[PDB]
């Protein structure tokens, strides 16, 4: 529980502990505040309970969309924006960490999809989505694929579906309209059609997994694949003439990858809300603070412009940073969880031939607004 002179943070154990703890130690060193980092397996169940008990964790780590649900669950207090930091960071990142016009988190790091290709097979990737299928046919002759997906999550499909003018929710006047989706939109039909053509014409395998395809990429069996800046895939800092670039764009359209932003929320019920608030912004994402914490991660791919500039010198990052500024911010709205389910079902039924595109997308928007 929360103690006087203490703060408790829960962050994905997979790689959560090392950086956060060392940063907590720095803040613990300065103020004497005892920091405690734990691994969040229980959080989903604890979330409602700790709030009801007026005392659980102080700070909650960001998921994908779920953090927005956490805001709706009142797991975070209203936060005050730092104008100086805004300049030091990026503008587009702030939308992801704001909800109902209020600041619910700080942007620490930026994740976006990018095209990862073998320079030896393809020295020049496609500039647009139209070029891919023609490009794929040529390298299909060599037993390569141009584009990778496994249709195990809607995350994979979105790049194709939204590319033609699709979108989760409409934003206007600083507010999202729950009644205005771009998932039942004509553009969404075109994007999903692209997916079907890729599978039907055997440009990509419907059953092949991301781990299998990434392994095939690692061996040069597949020319190109899609992943974020982490390049964890199934390999470590590769050296064999692999490269990273931005995703294709079609006829001047919003054809670019979605953007996720690392976020943190501060328990409103916490007696130590001020301790959490001050250190969060001043350590987790600053010139001094971010530098220390990134030491545990490979690249960082960070929301901090200054530190980003230096690490952005890697081909792996530079494309992700560019397409982050040109990509589309992933909504933090709780209904995004329904958007996840809504797309996944719609795509599978379409690809399996069980349901038509317009009908599946009609079901997709129905689920979101229901």
85 closest CA partner among 287, 267, 279? 287
Tell me the Cα Rg of the chain: 21
Burial of 291 per CB tally in 10 Å (0-12, 13-18, 19+): middle
- Determine the Cα–Cα distance for residues 232 and 359; give it in Å rounded to an integer: 37
Q: What's the order of all strands across the beta sheet hosting 34-38?
A: 34-38, 6-10, 59-61, 264-266
What is the enclosing helix (H) or strand (E) of 26? Answer: helix 17-31
Please state whether beta strands 224-227 and 98-99 pair in parallel, antiparallel, or not at all (unpaired).
unpaired
Beta strands in the chain (DSSP E): 6-10, 34-38, 59-61, 98-99, 102-103, 110-112, 114-118, 170-172, 175-177, 224-227, 242-245, 258-261, 264-266, 328-329
Neighbour-count burial for 61-70, b at 16+ CB within 10 Å, e otherwise: bbbebbbbbb
Burial of 139 per CB tally in 10 Å (0-12, 13-18, 19+): middle
- Are the C-beta atoms of residues 349 and 139 closer than 8 Å to each other? no
Distance, C-alpha 82 to centroid of its chain = 23
| Residue 77 three-state SS | coil
- Are the C-beta atoms of residues 114 and 244 closer than 8 Å to each other? yes
- Are the C-beta atoms of residues 337 and 154 closer than 8 Å to each other? no
| Residue 182 three-state SS | strand
Please state whether beta strands 242-245 and 114-118 pair in parallel, antiparallel, or not at all (unpaired).
antiparallel
| Residue 310 three-state SS | helix
The DSSP 8-state label assigned to residue 73 in this structure reads T
Residue 240 CB partners (closer than 8 Å, separation 6+): 118, 120
CB atoms within 10 A of CB 321: 22
- Determine the Cα–Cα distance for residues 256 and 128; give it in Å rounded to an integer: 10
Which residues partner with 109 through β-bridges?
Answer: 302
Q: Output the furthest CA–CA distance in the chain (Å, rounded).
A: 67
The DSSP 8-state label assigned to residue 62 in this structure reads -
- Determine the Cα–Cα distance for residues 278 and 269; give it in Å rounded to an integer: 16
Residue 135 CB partners (closer than 8 Å, separation 6+): 122, 126, 146
- Determine the Cα–Cα distance for residues 265 and 365; give it in Å rounded to an integer: 29
CB atoms within 10 A of CB 315: 14
321 closest CA partner among 343, 342, 306, 336? 306
- Determine the Cα–Cα distance for residues 361 and 319; give it in Å rounded to an integer: 31
Both tokens of 205, joined, read 């395998």
Beta strands in 64-158 (DSSP E): 98-99, 102-103, 110-112, 114-118
Both tokens of 130, joined, read 């139209």
Neighbour-count burial for 11-47, b at 16+ CB within 10 Å, e otherwise: beeeebbebbbebbebbbeeeebebebeebeebeebb
Both tokens of 344, joined, read 């996944």
Find where tokens 């969880």 sit: 337
| Residue 210 three-state SS | helix
Give the phi and the psi of residue 8 in degrees, each rounded to 5. -130, 120
Break-preceding residues in the chain (C–N over 2.5 Å): none
| Residue 359 three-state SS | helix
Find where tokens 């709205």 sit: 333
- Determine the Cα–Cα distance for residues 144 and 217; give it in Å rounded to an integer: 9
What is the enclosing helix (H) or strand (E) of 344? Answer: helix 336-351
- Determine the Cα–Cα distance for residues 95 and 89; give it in Å rounded to an integer: 12
CB atoms within 10 A of CB 344: 18
Q: What angle do CA 41, 364, 226 make, to 5 degrees?
A: 60
Both tokens of 268, joined, read 């409103």
| Residue 171 three-state SS | strand
- Determine the Cα–Cα distance for residues 9 and 276; give it in Å rounded to an integer: 10
User: Helices 336-351 and 357-369, interaxial angle, to 10°?
Assistant: 160
- Are the C-beta atoms of residues 11 and 61 closer than 8 Å to each other? yes
| Residue 79 three-state SS | strand
Q: Which domains does the chain have, with CATH numbers?
A: 5-111+260-331 (3.40.190.10), 112-259+332-369 (3.40.190.10)
Structural determination approach? NMR
At CB < 8 A and 24+ separation, what contacts does 308-313 make?
none
């Amino acid at each position: 529980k929360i103690e006087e002179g203490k703060l408790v943070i829960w962050i994905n154990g997979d790689k959560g502990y090392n950086g956060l703890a060392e940063v907590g130690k720095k803040f613990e060193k300065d103020t004497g505040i005892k920091v405690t980092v734990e691994h969040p397996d229980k959080l989903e169940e604890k979330f409602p309970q700790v709030a009801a008990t007026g005392d659980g964790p102080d700070i909650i780590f960001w998921a994908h969309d779920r953090f927005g649900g956490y805001a709706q669950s009142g797991l975070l207090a209203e936060i005050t924006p730092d104008k100086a930091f805004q300049d030091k960071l990026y503008p587009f990142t702030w939308d992801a960490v704001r909800y109902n016009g209020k600041l619910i988190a700080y942007p620490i790091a930026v994740e976006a999809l990018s095209l990862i290709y073998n320079k030896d097979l393809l020295p020049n990737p496609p500039k647009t989505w139209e070029e891919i299928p023609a490009l794929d046919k040529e390298l299909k002759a060599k037993g390569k694929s141009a584009l990778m997906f496994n249709l195990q999550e809607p995350y994979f499909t979105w790049p194709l579906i939204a590319a033609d003018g699709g979108y989760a929710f409409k934003y206007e006047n600083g507010k999202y309209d729950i009644k205005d989706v771009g998932v039942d939109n004509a553009g969404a039909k075109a994007g999903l059609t692209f997916l079907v053509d890729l599978i039907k014409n055997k440009h990509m395998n419907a059953d092949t997994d991301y781990s299998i395809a990434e392994a095939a990429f690692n061996k040069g069996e597949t020319a190109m694949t899609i992943n974020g800046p982490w390049a964890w895939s199934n390999i470590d800092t590769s050296k064999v003439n692999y490269g990273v670039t931005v995703l294709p764009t079609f006829k001047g359209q919003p054809s670019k990858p979605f953007v996720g932003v690392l976020s943190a929320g501060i328990n409103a019920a916490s007696p130590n809300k001020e301790l959490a608030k001050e250190f969060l912004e001043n350590y987790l994402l600053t010139d001094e603070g971010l530098e220390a914490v990134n030491k545990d991660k490979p690249l960082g791919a960070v929301a901090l412009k200054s530190y980003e500039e230096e690490l952005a010198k890697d081909p792996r990052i530079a494309a992700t940073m560019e397409n982050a500024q040109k990509g589309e911010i992933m909504p933090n709205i709780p209904q995004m969880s329904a958007f996840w389910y809504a797309v996944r079902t719609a795509v599978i039924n379409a690809a399996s031939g069980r349901q038509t595109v317009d009908e599946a997308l009609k079901d997709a928007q129905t689920r979101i607004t229901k």
